[PDB]
Amino acid sequence: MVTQLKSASEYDSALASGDKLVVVDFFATWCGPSKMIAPMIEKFAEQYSDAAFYKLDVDEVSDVAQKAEVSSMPTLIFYKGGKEVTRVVGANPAAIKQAIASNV
């Protein structure tokens, strides 16, 4: 499962995780590419147990989106220790999978 973040509060207390990798899908419901990356991140969430996967609607929580400087969807951001390690912009599932594997 991929847990949706609903406010800046939920987002912050999801970064406070420890060594466990935190993956966040910044998405838009109108955006085609963003919409079609969803089932792919669901599968990676199933395959990579040691990583906590989240999704955030950029229209819903614009403050987090702007603060993480997301200007395109999808943007998958990777966090370890409450800090950004890397990101993948655009709907390339193979690229996203690599970033997961390379980070836990």
Binding site: W30, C31, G32, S62, V70, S71, T75, G90, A91
Partner: protein, 139 residues
Amino acid sequence: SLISKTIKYDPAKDKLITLASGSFWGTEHMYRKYLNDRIVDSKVGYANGEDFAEVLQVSYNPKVITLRELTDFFFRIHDPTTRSGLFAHSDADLKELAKIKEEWQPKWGNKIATVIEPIKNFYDAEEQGYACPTHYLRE
């Protein structure tokens, strides 16, 4: 053709403008959410400037809405400093779009990279496209 084969369009009453804001998902989402009552028809496709851009083609009645209003909207819905294009269907409209861009320059810190060109081609199923830039109404 420079006109989509599916669009509602009357040459004796209507006009056309072809808009690229970086993703036709965003371009369609924005015009259909705010100006759907004021446009004739709207079709997503790929436009060529006189390499295809993802675009929305807007058919409209000048006595209902002007190009100026449609373009003012365009510069509010996406970030044109950064993929961003306006494709004119007449030479009169080309010079008006350029005028509008000039007027919008100070508000965007004079960094508008929007391309203004005559329309060269338009398709629908011509069968990047990896991501949509952020689309929302700026204030």
